Amino acid sequence: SSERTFIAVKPDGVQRGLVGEIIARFERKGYKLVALKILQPTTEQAQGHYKDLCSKPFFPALVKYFSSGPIVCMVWEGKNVVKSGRVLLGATNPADSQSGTIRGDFAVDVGRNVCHGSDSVESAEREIAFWFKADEI
Amino acid sequence: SSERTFIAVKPDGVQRGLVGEIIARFERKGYKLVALKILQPTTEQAQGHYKDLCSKPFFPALVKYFSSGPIVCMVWEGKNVVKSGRVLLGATNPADSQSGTIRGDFAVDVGRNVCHGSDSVESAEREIAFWFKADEIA
C-alpha cells in the first residue's frame, strides 16, 4: 500500500545511460515515484552507504567509486515494492543474476553493479531517511 | 557542450508511466543529465510558467492540469541540446507531430501532450532559473 523502497543508480549506471531504463521498469511494474534526485555523493555519504563494510578490505575503493560521479536516488511506492525491487534488480552479484533483470541485462562486476535496492522494509526506511528529507518525499 | 535545455514530464506523462521512456531517449541521444526533481507544482508556479498565456480563455484549465499532480523536472546539457530537445519531443501539437517523437508516439491532446521542452536557448535560460536553484544544477 504505502510501502516504500529506495533505488539508486550508481555512477557507472548513470555514465552508461541506464537511468531511464531502470525508471521505466519500475513504471512498467505499475509503481509510483514519490522522490527523485541526482547528486554526486560526498565521501561521508558513500562511507555511510557501505557502512557495514567499514572494516573489510578495500572499503575506501568502494567509497571512492560511489562518490566518483553523480548517482540517481529514487523512492518507489506501492504494494510489495521492496520485494519487487529485488525481483527487478536481480541478484546483487551479476554472476548469480539472471537475464531479464537489471543486473542480469547490464551488470558484470560485483563491485560496480549499476544499481542498489533496499533488501528489506527495515533497510528501506533507514536508506530513505539518509538520502531524503521528509519534505522531499 | 555546455548549452542547457529544460525538459518537464507533465502530470499526464507521469501518470501514464512515461518518465523512464523520456529520460532514456535523451540518454541514447548522448546528452548529460545535470538536474532532476519530482514535484507537484503550485498554482502560482504553473501560472508563472504559463504567464505569457494569462489572458487566454484556456489559461485556467492549463494551470489546473499542470498543477493537478507531480511533474518531473529535468535539465540536460550538451551541444545542440535545445535543438535536440525539440527534435526528440516533436511538434507541440500532436496533430502536427511525427511518429518517432515523444508526442508522435504517446500524445493526442494539445493540452495533455505528455512533456514540455524549451523551445529556445533564452527560453531555456528563464525556465531553468525558474524551476531550479544554482545549487541544484550539478
Side-chain angles (χ1 to χ4, degrees):
Chain A
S1 45
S2 65
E3 185 183 300
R4 287 170 179 170
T5 200
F6 175 75
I7 307 296
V9 184
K10 297 172 174 185
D12 55 323
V14 173
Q15 275 312 304
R16 290 175 60 186
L18 293 171
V19 172
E21 174 74 29
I22 293 165
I23 288 171
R25 296 200 186 187
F26 275 82
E27 290 175 294
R28 291 189 320 174
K29 195 70 167 187
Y31 283 113
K32 174 181 50 202
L33 190 51
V34 299
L36 179 70
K37 64 179 168 191
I38 177 158
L39 41 58
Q40 173 159 319
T42 59
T43 291
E44 310 86 284
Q45 281 172 315
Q47 285 183 4
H49 185 77
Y50 292 105
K51 191 183 181 179
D52 271 30
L53 301 174
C54 170
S55 73
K56 301 307 177 194
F58 295 95
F59 161 82
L62 292 158
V63 171
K64 192 169 177 71
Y65 148 70
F66 198 87
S67 50
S68 62
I71 69 178
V72 173
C73 296
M74 286 168 285
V75 179
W76 293 91
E77 187 178 293
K79 179 173 181 177
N80 290 134
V81 70
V82 175
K83 162 109 174 193
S84 286
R86 301 147 61 215
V87 166
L88 295 191
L89 296 210
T92 315
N93 174 27
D96 295 331
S97 71
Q98 260 311 325
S99 210
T101 69
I102 293 290
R103 298 200 187 88
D105 291 344
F106 308 107
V108 173
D109 192 276
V110 68
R112 304 170 44 136
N113 63 345
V114 175
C115 54
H116 160 87
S118 309
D119 47 27
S120 63
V121 165
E122 252 211 307
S123 79
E125 290 170 9
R126 287 193 266 107
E127 289 169 3
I128 297 167
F130 182 84
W131 291 100
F132 288 91
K133 279 305 179 57
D135 51 4
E136 315 198 293
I137 316 171
Chain B
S1 39
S2 181
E3 174 184 305
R4 282 155 183 180
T5 196
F6 171 78
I7 306 297
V9 186
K10 298 179 185 182
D12 52 332
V14 179
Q15 293 282 76
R16 294 175 60 196
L18 290 175
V19 177
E21 172 69 29
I22 292 178
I23 288 173
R25 296 205 186 183
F26 279 83
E27 294 176 292
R28 300 177 324 169
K29 188 66 166 185
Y31 285 110
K32 175 157 58 182
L33 183 68
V34 298
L36 198 63
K37 62 184 171 199
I38 179 158
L39 66 100
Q40 179 165 357
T42 64
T43 300
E44 289 86 5
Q45 278 150 345
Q47 290 175 355
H49 184 240
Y50 299 109
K51 81 181 164 190
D52 299 342
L53 274 33
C54 64
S55 313
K56 305 297 199 304
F58 55 82
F59 180 73
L62 191 65
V63 169
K64 285 163 198 158
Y65 143 85
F66 191 83
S67 52
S68 73
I71 75 173
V72 170
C73 291
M74 285 173 283
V75 181
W76 295 85
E77 178 171 301
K79 291 162 181 174
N80 295 0
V81 71
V82 175
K83 176 61 174 174
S84 281
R86 302 202 294 265
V87 168
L88 295 182
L89 295 204
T92 310
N93 186 341
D96 295 327
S97 74
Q98 293 323 297
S99 180
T101 63
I102 303 298
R103 280 130 179 190
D105 298 341
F106 304 109
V108 172
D109 301 328
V110 184
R112 287 169 246 271
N113 62 343
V114 171
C115 56
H116 162 77
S118 299
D119 78 331
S120 69
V121 171
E122 91 172 30
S123 181
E125 277 192 4
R126 295 190 320 271
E127 294 171 25
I128 286 170
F130 183 90
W131 289 106
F132 291 100
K133 298 188 176 189
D135 70 77
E136 288 183 292
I137 310 185

